[PDB]
A paper describes a structure:
1938 adopts a “V”-shaped conformation, with the acetylated indoline moiety nestled within a sub-pocket delineated by I459, L1006, and F1016, where it engages in a π‒π interaction with F1016. The other segment of 1938 aligns in a linear conformation, with the core pyridine ring forming a π‒π stacking interaction with Y641. Meanwhile, the nitrogen within the pyridine is positively charged, making salt bridges with the sidechain of D603, while the latter also forms one hydrogen bond with the nitrogen atom connecting the pyridine and benzene rings. Additionally, the central benzene is clasped by N605 and F1016, allowing the linked piperazine ring to approach the helical domain, where it makes massive hydrophobic contacts with P539, L540, and L570. Looking at the other regions of p110α, residues 1002–1016 shift from the helical domain towards the active site, opening the allosteric site to accommodate 1938 binding. The 1938-bound structure also reveals conformational changes in the activation loop (residues 933–958) and P loop (residues 771–777) compared to the unliganded state. Additionally, a 3.8 Å lateral displacement in the membrane-binding loop (residues 966–974) was observed in the Cα position of C971. The ABD of the 1938-bound PI3Kα undergoes an outward displacement of 3.1 Å compared to its unliganded state, and a larger displacement of 3.5 Å compared to the BYL-719-bound state. Consequently, the enhanced flexibility of the ABD allows for large fluctuations in the iSH2 junction upon 1938 binding. These movements reorganize the interface among iSH2, ABD, and C2 domains, leading to a weakened interaction network between p110α and p85α.
Residue numbers in the entry:
A (entry chain B): 326 to 336, 340 to 360, 366 to 414, 421 to 429, 441 to 585
B (entry chain A): 18 to 234, 246 to 310, 323 to 500, 524 to 863, 873 to 942, 950 to 1050
């Protein structure tokens, strides 16, 4: 039969894209006679070169089969053994206006995605810094708690009220430091809580930044196909 | 100034110490104990020199400043508080750990925290390699330690290309020996004419014979140094095999050497002490017996960041992979609403379990669905994650598992990412995904090697012989048809005679089988060796089998010389990421090479540190950096000097980048001068080894000539002195450009490729000279660029008509030097014409091409190294270039100068086109590096097109001729 106009024929990136996530048994014939057939089997796109010699086409010698379309039809009728060749892959002013509009839409989508990506990376930076600061605050609070425990263990034994030595040191000095020390520990705990709250808020905002990111992609890749098909017409 | 630090004495009382910002810890401790007397309970407190400080820094690490003399500025303490406690740990271990943590960038305590058995085993087992390397270094001290510290910078083969050989004066070179042996440095220069095959020992013997008036009869007492830089000829190599010597031969310069006493450097070498750290102290059925199709259960994805309205449903794509090629078709889980991401489905795969290859993997991806568009309902992968089917100890993963799915990379159109990290995302806010595997009532392990070599060995004209060679000579990035695979596997046994066919026969094996893989193992066991440039192919994602990569590493060890290893090092470091496990032969080889040679080790460390900011390869590179720094020796003290130094610059640029980015360069320059006059900046920047070349030492900054460029990014034009005594010989000033925000891995790759091109052309006999200057990326968007001096941009020369450049070249070389000034100009012009045509470097205006006063011409900036701006001759020869090449005329295009120029261009192009496999490998092994313009296989398809690999030699030459005629308007 005639060639240059068929569903299977297409005359490597395009072949891979077309056969990507395609069903088993698919076959696409294209030139790379060369007449290379890309057949999808085992989840991978096998290649078979159609040998053309002595005015005869064939996968392997002898080239008994006559024409490439004849080969495609025959191996669509029967399996290649081991897989049958199942279903294959196959005005000017208006097209110009559509191309311009989809170009503008693609630029808008790209700018929006870039802005979302930059915001995502930035918020990730602040999230990491805030988490590190919170861990440092935890460590500082632990050290202060150990210091307070040691101070409370030591003060009573070392110098309680006037009995041992408490004339005015415990009231003026001994208990002054214990209360003075407790002032910073409580404030340090206060700073951790305040910063911890901010981290949760950023996580939600960082969470939301992902919501806009995981919806634009479906609406932008499909934009490429419309742009790709309309832009790659020029006829 | 006074910062009002807080002190927590062992009693508990808090003391406020008004201490200056630039104060040491000893004085602070003394003042604190002096004030503690006024405080109560001062009875319990002991003497000052009996307690140690503890604090928390900005890295959330609790550390004890044992005796660190660094002021509280360098402490980086998170809060101005300091507890006092009696020291418990070893001073040596803590100090070394602090230095390692500063060099690496992440505190070493984190690795101790990590509970992963594989991580702990790697940490305790890389110490074996570290110890053997350290033992080898100290085998023949102090000579061996000297060779480690100052390695011989030599070439790959003693034999010289004929052109440079004829450049010599009948095999005799005229060197100059400088001797400073006297009460004061007098620089006694002796001109000595000696062969180019004499070892440095004979050079020194004949120098002694001269120096001594006219004869003497020193021996085994002196060594040779390169004047003006720290490179020593300590090895028994011919005097012309050293890179400096051969560079002087080629460039027509007198080699100015120096005679230095051996004891001088032997005493200058501090002793390296490597101490094993603390962590070094701490029912099986053959997998082939199990007979059942692999089954894996998906339970639930607890966390998913999806939009209910925009996403109808979600599902988990899965696949069983080997490299990047599925072993069986992907299975899928039934769609479910995004709100309730629970599946609880036992996916069943087509792969019979015993037929699992060792390098097998399971790639999962949680992805949404959107059928609104119509027939082709677009699918977007929300997250991905890989899982090795075998543990580091050859065990099938069993039981339940929880995997944090990494975010999908930008531009990853596909659903499954089978090349990424095979591990859980460290971040715990990531979308988890729970999995379960089958339980076989026992532990299943890959069968032992002997078991495999029994299956195979029990389960087994020129018409075709030309086809095998035609295939082998083909590109590794080309296409192989099923007839070719079946043909190769049919003649697997005969392929041994063609040892360079393994990179292809490997693709001809069905990893889905057991007999085929067993026979492939029995073949790779007895394979004749291959070249290192061909064994770098077997070290890519394509070839993840344990034994294939073990064989490739054996070839690299046997045949890869240090000169090559220092060039194909970026690629090996990058390929480190794509390795299955943490403890593998490649890392052992690279670590031993980095520990037995500081020249390789310096760049090894810097490449690892640069790549250790992407969280994907943060942990592996941190473990490796720790293992290196533990046995790095004394070089740590130098590396830190560089590290902090770069920091002191980075911050500065940032302050100028946005804070003061309001006024013109006048205020920026004033602020830069003010910040450089500060004692901290002055003390940090001066006095350290240059990261670009450890030989060069940078002395006092010349703040007079340090300015901020007019370039768009506004880099730093840093000027330094040369502390070396003989600085006048090489260069009295050392200049560098510090660029913040511009990726410099593209420039590094282009310069490495240009260096390889120059080496190829030197070997071929085409003396094309290029400037592949130095360039390092010290992080992300931060880098150092060498500055070539005495060279003016083509715009400046013209600015200072179509004859301006030629007039300037004539002026700078008045006399007989005109012949050389024109020949070198034309040769360099041809070299860059070919090189920037093949690599498609960005289009060139005047500013990107600059010429030395001598005549050489080089391109400076890069960043379009595969024509990623949507062939495209960038270096179209301007009128001025052709006028200079033809020596000045109006009928330029019709002179013998054109004929010679085009002949050299064609020769270079064909020489490169005969070595396309190397460049394809170099570009493909760094696809994942993340460069803005090397990200898809179309980028390397551009290289394949420019080299015209598909066509034939005559077709390729005609294609290049047509491209030239199109570019320079015919000729
Ligand atoms: C007929 C020949 N076929 C089969 C062999 N095939 C192949 C060639 C080279 C490599 N090496 C490699 C692969 C890497 N990942 C990538 C693999 C594939 C695509 C992309 C990768 N990207 C990353 C990680 O960013 C960008 C997009 C990274 C480093 N090196 C792997 C496979 C080419 C097609």
């Amino acid at each position: 039969m005639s060639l240059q106009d068929a569903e299977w024929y297409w005359g490597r990136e395009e072949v891979n894209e077309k056969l990507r996530d395609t069903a088993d048994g698919t076959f696409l014939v294209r030139d790379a006679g060369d007449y290379t057939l890309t057949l999808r089997k085992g989840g991978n796109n096998k290649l078979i070169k159609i040998f053309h010699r002595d005015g005869k086409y064939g996968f392997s010698d002898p080239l008994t089969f006559s024409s490439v379309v004849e080969l495609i039809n025959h191996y669509r009728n029967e399996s290649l053994a081991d897989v049958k060749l199942l279903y294959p892959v196959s005005n000017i002013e208006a097209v110009g206006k559509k191309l311009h509009e989809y170009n503008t839409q693609f630029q808008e989508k790209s700018r929006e995605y870039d802005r979302l990506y930059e915001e995502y990376t930035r918020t990730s930076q602040e999230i990491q810094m805030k988490r590190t600061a919170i861990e440092a605050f935890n460590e500082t609070i632990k050290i202060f708690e150990e210091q307070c425990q040691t101070q409370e263990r030591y003060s009573k034994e070392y110098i309680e009220k006037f009995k041992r030595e408490g004339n005015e040191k415990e009231i003026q000095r001994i208990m002054h430091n214990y209360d003075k020390l407790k002032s910073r520990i409580s404030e340090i705990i206060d700073s951790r809580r305040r910063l911890e709250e901010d981290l949760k808020k950023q996580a939600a905002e960082y969470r939301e930044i992902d919501k806009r990111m995981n919806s634009i992609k479906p609406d932008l890749i499909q934009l490429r196909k419309t742009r790709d098909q309309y832009l790659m017409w020029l006829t | 100034p006074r910062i009002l630090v807080e002190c927590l004495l062992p009693n508990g009382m808090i003391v406020t110490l008004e201490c200056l910002r630039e104060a040491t810890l000893i004085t602070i401790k003394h003042e604190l104990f002096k004030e503690a007397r006024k405080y109560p309970l001062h009875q319990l407190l002991q003497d000052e020199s009996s307690y140690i400080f503890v604090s928390v820094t900005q890295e959330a690490e609790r550390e004890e400043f044992f005796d660190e003399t660094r002021r509280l500025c360098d402490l980086r303490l998170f809060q101005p508080f300091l507890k006092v406690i009696e020291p418990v740990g070893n001073r040596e271990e803590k100090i070394l750990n602090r230095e390692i943590g500063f060099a690496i960038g992440m505190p070493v305590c984190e690795f101790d925290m990590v509970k992963d058995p594989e991580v702990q085993d790697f940490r305790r087992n890389i110490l074996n390699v570290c110890k053997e390397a350290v033992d080898l270094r100290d085998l023949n001290s102090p000579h061996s330690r000297a060779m480690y510290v100052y390695p011989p910078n030599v070439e790959s083969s003693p034999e010289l290309p004929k052109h440079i050989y004829n450049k010599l004066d009948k095999g005799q070179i005229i060197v100059v020996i400088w001797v400073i042996v006297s009460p004061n440095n007098d620089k006694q220069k002796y001109t000595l004419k000696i062969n180019h095959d004499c070892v440095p020992e004979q050079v020194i013997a004949e120098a002694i014979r001269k120096k001594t008036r006219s004869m003497l009869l020193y021996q085994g007492k002196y060594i040779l140094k390169v004047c003006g830089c720290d490179e020593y000829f300590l090895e028994k190599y011919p005097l012309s095999q050293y890179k400096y010597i051969r560079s002087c031969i080629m460039l027509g310069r007198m080699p100015n050497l120096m005679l230095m006493a051996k004891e001088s450097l032997y005493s200058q070498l501090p002793m390296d002490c490597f101490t094993m750290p603390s962590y070094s102290r701490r029912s099986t059925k053959s997998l082939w017996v199990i007979n059942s199709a692999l089954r894996i259960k998906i339970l639930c994805a607890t966390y998913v960041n999806v939009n209910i309205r925009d996403i109808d449903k979600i599902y988990v794509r899965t696949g069983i992979y080997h490299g990047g090629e599925p072993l069986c078709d992907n299975v899928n889980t039934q769609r479910v609403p995004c709100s309730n991401p629970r599946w609880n489905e036992w996916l069943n795969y087509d792969i019979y379990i015993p037929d699992l290859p060792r390098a097998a993997r399971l790639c999962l991806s949680i992805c949404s669905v959107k059928g609104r568009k119509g027939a082709k309902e677009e699918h977007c992968p929300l997250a991905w994650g890989n899982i090795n089917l075998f543990d580091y100890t050859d065990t099938l993963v069993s039981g339940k598992m929880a995997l944090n799915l990494w975010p999908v990379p930008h531009g990853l159109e596909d659903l499954l990412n089978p090349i990424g990290v095979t591990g859980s995302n460290p971040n715990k806010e990531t979308p988890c995904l729970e999995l379960e595997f089958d339980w076989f009532s026992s532990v299943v392990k890959f069968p032992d090697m002997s078991v495999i070599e029994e299956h195979a060995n029990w389960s087994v004209r020129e018409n075709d012989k030309e086809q095998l060679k035609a295939i082998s000579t083909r590109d590794p990035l080309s296409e192989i048809t099923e007839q070719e695979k079946d043909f190769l596997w049919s003649h697997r046994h005969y392929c041994v005679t063609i040892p360079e066919i393994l990179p292809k026969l490997l693709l001809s094996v069905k990893w889905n089988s057991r007999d085929e893989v067993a026979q492939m193992y029995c073949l790779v066991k007895d394979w004749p060796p291959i070249k290192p440039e061909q064994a770098m192919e077997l070290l890519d994602c394509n070839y993840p089998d344990p034994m294939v990569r073990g064989f490739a590493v054996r070839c690299l060890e046997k045949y890869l010389t240090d000169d090559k290893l220092s060039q194909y090092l970026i690629q090996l470091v990058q390929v480190l990421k794509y390795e299955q496990y943490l403890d593998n032969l490649l890392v052992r080889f690279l670590l031993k090479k980095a520990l037995t040679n500081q020249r390789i080790g310096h760049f090894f460390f810097w490449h690892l540190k640069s790549e250790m900011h992407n969280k994907t390869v943060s942990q592996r590179f941190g473990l490796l950096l720790e293992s290196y720094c533990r046995a790095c020796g004394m070089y740590l003290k130098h590396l830190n000097r560089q590290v902090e130094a770069m920091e002191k610059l980075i911050n500065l640029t940032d302050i100028l980048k946005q804070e003061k980015k309001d006024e013109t360069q006048k205020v920026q320059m004033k602020f830069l001068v003010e910040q450089m006059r500060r004692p901290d900046f002055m003390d940090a920047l001066q006095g350290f080894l240059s990261p670009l070349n450890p030989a060069h030492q940078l002395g006092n900054l010349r703040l007079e000539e340090c300015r901020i460029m007019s370039s768009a990014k506004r880099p730093l034009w840093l000027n330094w002195e040369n502390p070396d005594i003989m600085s006048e010989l090489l260069f009295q000033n050392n200049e560098i450009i510090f660029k913040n925000g511009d990726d410099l891995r593209q420039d590094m790759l282009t310069l490495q490729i240009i260096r390889i091109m120059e080496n190829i052309w030197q070997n071929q006999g085409l003396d094309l000279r290029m400037l592949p200057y130095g360039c390092l990326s010290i992080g992300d968007c931060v880098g150092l660029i060498e500055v070539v001096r005495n060279s003016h941009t083509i715009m400046q020369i013209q600015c200072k008509n179509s004859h301006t450049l030629h007039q300037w070249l004539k002026d700078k070389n008045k006399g007989e030097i005109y012949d050389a000034a024109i020949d070198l100009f034309t040769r360099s012009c041809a070299g860059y014409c070919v090189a920037t045509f093949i690599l498609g470097i960005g289009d060139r205006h005047n500013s990107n091409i600059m010429v030395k006063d001598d005549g050489q011409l080089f391109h400076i900036d890069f960043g379009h190294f595969l024509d990623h701006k949507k062939e495209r001759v960038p270096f179209v020869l301007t009128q001025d270039f052709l006028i200079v090449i033809s020596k000045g005329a109006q009928e330029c295009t019709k002179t013998r100068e054109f004929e010679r120029f085009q002949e050299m261009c064609y020769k270079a192009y064909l020489a490169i086109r005969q070595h396309a496999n190397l460049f394809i490998n170099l570009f493909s092994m760094m696809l994942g590096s993340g460069m803005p313009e090397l990200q898809s296989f179309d980028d390397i398809a551009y290289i394949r097109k420019t080299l015209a690999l598909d066509k034939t030699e005559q077709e390729a030459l005609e294609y290049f001729m047509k491209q030239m005629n199109d570019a320079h308007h015919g000729g």
